[PDB]
């Protein structure tokens, strides 16, 4: 009942099997109690408008998640920070 959109960046300096491994794990983290993933969009690499972490480029991912009990995305918000394949991320509600 709360349309959680999340979207995140992946570091450019990886190999592509790991790149299609992260999109498999983090869409299984959201798969706990309602995935509802209507788009796993690899809206691809651009030059982001400034510089972060000596990285001039990034790999975006756009994920839509619908849920009710709203426990699910906070597992992502804990577990995405501690790793370092994701330089920035957002979760934003919409109803």
Partner RNA sequence: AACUUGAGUGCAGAAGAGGAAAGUGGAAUUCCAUGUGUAGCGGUGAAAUGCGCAGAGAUAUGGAGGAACACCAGUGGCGAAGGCGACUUUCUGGUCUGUAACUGACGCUGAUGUGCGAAAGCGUGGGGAUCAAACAGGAUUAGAUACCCUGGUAGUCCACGCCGUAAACGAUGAGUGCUAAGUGUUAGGGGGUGCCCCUUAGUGCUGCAGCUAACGCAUUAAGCACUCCGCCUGGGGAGUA
Partner RNA sequence: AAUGUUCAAA
**List of residues contacting RNA (CB under 7 A):** 2, 50, 52, 54, 70, 77, 81, 88, 90-94
β-bridge mates for residue 47, sequence order? 57
> Whose CA is closest to 37, among 53, 52, 26, 45?
26
| Binds other proteins (CB under 8 A): choice among 21, 53, 79, 93 | 79
For position 71 contacting other proteins by CB under 8 A, the verdict is no
14 binds other proteins (CB under 8 A): no
Contacts of 24 (CB under 8 A, 6+ apart): none
Q: Are the beta carbons of 31 and 39 closer than 8 angstroms? A: no
CB of 73 to RNA, least distance (A): 7
| 44, 50, 54, 95: residue in contact with other proteins (rule CB under 8 A) | 50
């Amino acid at each position: 009942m709360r349309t959680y959109e999340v979207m995140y960046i992946v570091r450019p300096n990886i190999e592509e099997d790991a790149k299609k491994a992260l999109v498999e794990r983090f869409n299984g983290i959201l798969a706990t109690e309602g995935a509802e993933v209507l788009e796993a969009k690899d809206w691809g690499k651009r030059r982001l408008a400034y510089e972060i972490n000596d990285f001039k480029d990034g790999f975006y991912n756009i994920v839509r998640v619908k849920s009710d009990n709203n426990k699910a995305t906070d597992e992502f918000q804990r577990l995405a920070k501690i790793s370092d394949d994701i330089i920035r991320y957002m979760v934003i509600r919409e109803d």
